[PDB]
Design a binder for this molecule. Structure first.
Ligand code: HEM
Length: 399
């Protein structure tokens, strides 16, 4: 059984194993870091089954849960938030914060999203690139989702820049463990204090809604509110940063499609849909353990055996998406959903917010900077390490 996670075939490409497994052995066993075996599911139809089957559990203290690293094994010990819950606990807690992320709520946020993107682009323009390329990640891709989610949570404007840097330090590949866990503690301590404050004078933010509607009535206590706030911050931010940078890089690699977006910014939504299928930047979140024996394809998955469902592989599934390895924002979409945001009850709470952020970015960026160019040869883009989710560490641009 091969070791899993697999390595990406190159900087921007999924692991090569997935295409072979889809063709010859679509439900197979893999070996995890601790020697245990897990089932790997690779076809779109089977990923959807794993994401919705009531015989499968997300509870991480169940025997067989497929932790992929040593830190996940010990993180399993903490009191769970709704990301690690089964029904009915899952939606009981998820519904406490879902109101901010509905399509109606995200529609009302759209002027604020546009203003955030506008302001940060104008700052980048004023900084200029007269003294060399600027890092699109540091200058734009990082602050855009960071400022927005921090602001929704209730962080005051003056604290955004420091806290944006701390959260980046958490996930930066060159941070030592001491740097990353210090940045983590910094974030937790700040949120605890913000929860204390909002308990005394609520404002109009997510933390205030939790304090008023759930902590004070006694449905949760303030430490749960901290954990939930922390989950909403760290679950998708690094992914958002990577998607923005990957979109720029992808467009530099497909000049004809960038020219179409320049001449018709209304194609941004279609570009975003294809971006999220092609570059599946969160590919290791759909994991389960079997509560009962369950049959998947031609395999029997025994109770207490772990399952990993690759939505990255599903998004390249030849049986669903014609020419899946071509990036084509003009593709015709089948009836099946792309699975960039997962599937079923656990499907990304922030799907609509994420798409609205991405859509706002790519309908504005090249109107503001029509001559935006990646400043290094495309073969020299600094992608994330091949053993991690696809992403871009830094992206020097001129404009
Ligand atoms: C392009 C950006 C993003 C992508 C591709 C993405 C992707 C995903 C995926 C694949 C999952 C697993 C869903 C499943 O288990 O089926 C997920 C879950 C989740 N994501 Fe995101 N995400 C993004 C942005 C965000 C943002 C901005 C936030 C928070 C503001 C967020 C918060 C969450 C949470 C809380 C969950 C767990 C939901 C649950 O288990 O009920 N994500 N996301």
């Amino acid at each position: 059984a091969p070791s899993f996670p697999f390595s990406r075939a190159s900087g921007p490409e999924p692991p090569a194993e997935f295409a072979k497994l889809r063709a010859t052995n679509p439900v197979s066993q893999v070996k995890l870091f601790d020697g245990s075996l897990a089932w790997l599911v690779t076809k779109h139809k089977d990923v959807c089954f794993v994401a919705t089957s009531e015989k499968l559990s997300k509870v991480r203290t169940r025997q067989g849960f497929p932790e992929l690293s040593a830190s996940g094994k010990q993180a399993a010990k903490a009191k769970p938030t709704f990301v690690d819950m089964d029904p009915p606990e899952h939606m009981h807690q998820r519904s406490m914060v879902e109101p901010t992320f509905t399509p109606e709520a995200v529609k009302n946020l759209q002027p604020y999203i546009q203003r955030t993107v506008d302001d940060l682009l104008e700052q980048m323009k004023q900084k200029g690139c007269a003294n060399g390329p600027v890092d699109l990640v540091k200058e734009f891709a990082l602050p855009v989702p960071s400022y927005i989610i921090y602001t929704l949570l209730g962080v005051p404007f003056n604290d955004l820049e420091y806290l944006t840097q701390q959260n980046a330090i958490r996930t930066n590949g060159s941070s030592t463990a001491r740097e990353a866990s210090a940045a983590n503690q910094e974030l937790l301590d700040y949120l605890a204090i913000l929860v204390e404050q909002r308990l005394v004078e609520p404002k109009d933010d997510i933390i205030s809604k939790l304090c008023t509607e759930q902590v004070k009535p006694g449905n949760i206590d303030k430490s749960d509110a901290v954990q939930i706030a922390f989950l909403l911050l760290v679950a998708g931010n690094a992914t958002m940063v990577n998607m923005i940078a990957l979109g720029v890089a992808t467009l530099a690699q497909h000049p004809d499609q960038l020219a179409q977006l320049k001449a018709n910014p209304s194609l941004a939504p279609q570009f975003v849909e294809e971006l999220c299928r092609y570059h599946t930047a969160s590919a290791l979140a759909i994991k389960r353990t079997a509560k009962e024996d369950v049959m998947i394809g031609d395999k029997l998955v025994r109770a207490n055996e772990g399952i990993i469902a690759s939505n990255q592989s599903a998004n390249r599934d030849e049986e669903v998406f014609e020419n899946p390895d071509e990036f084509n924002m003009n593709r015709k979409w089948p009836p099946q959903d792309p699975l960039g945001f997962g599937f079923g009850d656990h499907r990304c709470i922030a799907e609509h917010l994420a798409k609205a952020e991405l859509t706002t970015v790519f309908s504005t960026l090249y109107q503001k900077f029509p001559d935006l160019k990646v400043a290094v040869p495309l073969g020299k883009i600094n992608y994330t390490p091949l053993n991690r989710d696809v992403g871009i560490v830094d992206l020097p641009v001129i404009f």
